[PDB]
Amino acid sequence: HGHVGADLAALCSEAALQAIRKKMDAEVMNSLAVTMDDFRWALSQSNPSALRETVVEVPQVTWEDIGGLEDVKRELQELVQYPVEHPDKFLKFGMTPSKGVLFYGPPGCGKTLLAKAIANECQANFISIKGPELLTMWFGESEANVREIFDKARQAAPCVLFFDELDSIAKARGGGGGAADRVINQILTEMDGMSTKKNVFIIGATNRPDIIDPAILRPGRLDQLIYIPLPDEKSRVAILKANLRKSPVAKDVDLEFLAKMTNGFSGADLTEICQRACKLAIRESIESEIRRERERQTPVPEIRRDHFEEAMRFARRSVSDNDIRKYEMFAQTLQQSRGFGSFRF
Amino acid sequence: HGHVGADLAALCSEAALQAIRKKMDAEVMNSLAVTMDDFRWALSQSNPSALRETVVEVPQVTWEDIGGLEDVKRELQELVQYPVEHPDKFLKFGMTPSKGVLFYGPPGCGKTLLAKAIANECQANFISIKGPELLTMWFGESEANVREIFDKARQAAPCVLFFDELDSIAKARGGGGGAADRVINQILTEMDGMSTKKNVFIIGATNRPDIIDPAILRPGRLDQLIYIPLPDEKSRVAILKANLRKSPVAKDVDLEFLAKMTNGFSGADLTEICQRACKLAIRESIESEIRRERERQTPVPEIRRDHFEEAMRFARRSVSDNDIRKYEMFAQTLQQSRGFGSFRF
Q: A234, A236, A216: which is closest to A225 by C-alpha?
């Protein structure tokens, strides 16, 4: 990751030289074996340069890592895919495609992997602007490097410009102020700049949806807001299956049972359940090797479900019942139907 | 109103003597004509004594004056009628009938006429304890006259003890305090005292549901809370029809059109629409009599729909969009389903 072609040449170079300095003696030269251990050493000792240069890439989440969220899935399809994959209908009905949408909800409930998924269906380059980048632009007073971000979105079109943690700045000046940050204002300017063409969609997501600039939520700007709740039972069984993918997990482990036990568990907590089960399998397997080598020389092939019990004993429902309460209060702050239901004639 | 049998005898006496002092001359004595004008004069000059003695009476609202509120109607039936009209099933399933329920919502949206209606189906004596009575008990430090109210409910069983404006005291000490009022505590004592038998149901209703004592909302006490929203289109067409009942209203007036125009209008505002239409019909009819008698001697049979236009010009949606917002926030403070939906097995 963060490896340009010259970095890859350096990687192959140092791996081949690790093979050379592993052989360590002319026919033996031709019999060199560049084995995966050499490439792993080269990776552990490779200094890449292409970090801090944000990568545009169609991500790999495929909407099955993020299960559930079916109405949110329909809104995201209608907001991203329909403008770009069926653009004739939009110009037929005269609807301008929406410039942006704004996720909100509990932290780490599958918001980043919910814009990657729709960027994957859209086959659009995904540009994630994390919260530290916005903060860095707010502190160096370099509020004009978000012109570069939007320009990079323009060249890398179609896009999903995931302004992750859009309320980082508002948290960073909690309190003389009141609205309209340094670089939030530049995001507003360069968001009002581009037309509804060029298929660049800003999906900036906020943990705290009330402290944000209310000028962001104006129409034309990120006017659609989409509540991303805590995972439903389908959503968190898909989350548990996705976090445990590529990891050798047992057959007698019942992942739907785990997803059925865990009600208020955010997606990040469901990762930390698996990352404390994998870690505990590491501990047991390493201890197995240790007491084998010291005694038997002189295996835990899979994460057994007894690891998903003593690992799940340290289960912290990280988001409170009063955080999601306030997110619901903001949610039907945005719900003001109020009697215009059954509008018939 | 407020007339005991001795007061009715005094009423007939003064009406008959008004007939006597209207005749004002023995055969003419037998030809006295006690006409309705004499009874109306007697009523206008009758001093009744039975006021300030609260009346227990099966009220006349019949659930059609309060239209709509269908789920609220089902909850009130299940809470009042089913304990008293089908009590075998409750002792079969071991369910104790709930001691009380607590309405809340926007002021004057049909909360008083929503406990009268269910007291009418239940055919239960309806005891309305208005907010000034609770305030009077809180100021005189006579917090032991609510023992008498509950005792009167016990004798007048089955009851609907509508503790109207239960949060009068909490408004009267808005702010050193914090909870547990003088006579709210006695309401709690005599509410916990009576058993689930005797069929006495407390339906105390609050405009402000958050300032009330949180010990009221404990189970056993007024644990069920029922949101009484602003009238729906069926509800406010029934309200407009009920307020205009006994008043001569035209045929070309379209009351469903009125109820369809008025979205945020509380029930009290829909009364003041009709009580400014009736008042303007009074003005036009009286002015008709005035310019007839001064000129033609020397009719507005009905409230025409041109009165319901210039009367509707002075239409004040009295409850704001921020009051009902807070009532909805309290309502989904009482909604924490949150993932236990689709609890299957």
A: A216
In chain A, the N- to C-terminal Cα span, in Å, equals 58
Residue B178 φ/ψ region, left for φ over 0, alpha for ψ in the -120 to 50 degree band, beta for the rest: left
The experimental method behind these coordinates is cryo-EM
Task: Tell me the pairing of strands A125-128 and A159-162.
Answer: parallel
* Angstroms from B313 CA to nearest CA on chain A: 21
Q: What count of Cα atoms within 13 Å lies in the side-chain half-sphere of residue B66?
A: 27
Angle at A208 between CA A206 and CA A211, to 5 degrees: 105
β-pairing verdict for B159-162 and B200-202: parallel
Cα A112 from Cα A302, distance rounded (Å):
29
Q: Do A338 and B233 touch (CB under 8 A)?
A: no
Q: Is B339 annotated as a binding residue?
A: no
A96 is in an annotated binding site: no
B336, A329 contact by CB (below 8 A): no
Answer yes or no: are the C-beta atoms of B160 and B119 closer than 8 Å: yes
Q: Assess contact for B75 and B47: CB atoms under 8 A.
A: no
Query: Chain A within 8 Å of B328 (Cβ-Cβ)?
Result: yes
User: Within a 10 A sphere around the Cβ of A26, how many other Cβ atoms?
Assistant: 5
Nearest one of B103, B113, B100, B114 to B153, comparing CA atoms? B100
CA distance A313 to chain B (A): 21
How many CB atoms within 10 Å of residue A1? 7
In angstroms, this model's resolution equals 3.3
Compute φ and ψ for A222, nearest 5 degrees: -70, 75
Query: Residue B221's closest CA among B180, B254, B174?
Result: B180
Q: How far apart are the first and last CA of chain B?
A: 58
Angle made by CA atoms B75, B78, B82, in degrees to the nearest 5:
165
Chain B residues whose CB is inside 8 A of the A328 CB are: 332
